[PDB]
Design a protein around this ligand. Structure first.
Ligand SMILES: C[C@@H]1CCC[C@H](n2cnc(-c3cc(Cl)ccc3-n3cc(Cl)nn3)cc2=O)c2cc(ccn2)-c2c(cnn2C(F)F)NC1=O
Ligand SMILES: *[C@@H]1O[C@H](CO)[C@@H](O)[C@H](O)[C@H]1NC(C)=O
Length: 237
């Protein structure tokens, strides 16, 4: 997260850090708890993932340095990638992880609500992007989970910034026109979380952008409300 600030314990209890153990263990992507055995994340995270056996989902983590040999994690039974997905910039950048066990909810690990289908066109004004990603283009994964409040940008304005890519109704853009705050490397798959009428909703999945936090180059997020039926279908199978 460029231009973000430190989160506190229990602030973002739906945020997870998805690690791969192969060839060596490392943070791969963010994700969000959405159900009792379900993480919602980005399809592009799995480009080099040979099998679900190498994945570990860590919930209830503030600092990456908390992740040691005996730290509790959830295994992954199945990776479900949207069957129309090809590449982040062409959309459908959405995936589910079916966990090996159910998740017992606490103040440090609990699900975020999907957006209401009735709020399909709502212009949310209390939206936050979170993650352990870079603070600038050439940086490192951060220890403490960072947050940044970022405004939504209309798809019409967003499309003007990305003449080389189709910004579809299944994408949502967010960023400051004057730049300065955005997702960056290591944040993808995590949430764009918006608080509306005292309830947090998972409005976006961090997907792609051109550079990090540049002027007039908003971040592009999977528009979760446009996939509610797909999510319900896959999570009940
Ligand atoms: C396979 C996965 C995910 C691969 C894509 C991932 N990604 C790509 N675009 C964004 C992005 C999103 C928005 Cl909304 C706006 C601007 C973005 N933007 C533009 C540029 Cl330039 N940078 N960000 C975020 C992001 O996270 C990524 C992650 C790492 C390195 C490079 N890209 C990585 C890891 C592990 N460690 N690192 C470490 F190198 F950061 N994961 C992997 O490589
Ligand atoms: C959840 O809590 C119940 C009741 O304490 C316990 O029996 C069970 O093992 C826990 N399961 C997980 C996956 O944490």
């Amino acid at each position: 997260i460029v231009g973000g600030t430190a989160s506190v314990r229990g602030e973002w209890p739906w945020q997870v850090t998805l690690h791969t153990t192969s060839p060596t263990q490392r943070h791969l992507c963010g994700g969000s708890i959405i159900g009792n055995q379900w993480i919602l994340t980005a399809a592009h995270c799995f480009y080099g993932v040979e099998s679900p056996k190498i994945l570990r989902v860590y919930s209830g983590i503030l600092n990456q340095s908390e992740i040691k040999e005996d730290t509790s994690f959830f295994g992954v039974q199945e990776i479900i990638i949207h069957d129309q997905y090809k590449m982040a910039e062409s959309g459908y950048d959405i995936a589910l992880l079916k966990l090996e066990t159910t998740v017992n909810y606490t103040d440090s690990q609990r699900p975020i609500s999907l957006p209401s289908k009735g709020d399909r066109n709502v212009i949310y004004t209390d939206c936050w992007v979170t993650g352990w990603g870079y603070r600038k283009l050439r940086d490192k994964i951060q220890n403490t989970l960072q947050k940044a409040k970022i405004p939504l940008v209309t798809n019409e304005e967003c499309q003007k910034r990305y003449r080389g890519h189709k910004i579809t109704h299944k994408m949502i853009c967010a960023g400051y026109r004057e730049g300065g705050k955005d997702a960056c490397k290591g944040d993808s798959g995590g949430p764009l979380s918006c608080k509306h009428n005292e309830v947090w909703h998972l409005v976006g999945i961090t997907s792609w952008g051109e550079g990090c936090a540049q002027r007039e180059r908003p971040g592009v997020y999977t528009n979760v409300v446009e996939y509610v039926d797909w999510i319900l279908e896959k999570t009940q199978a």
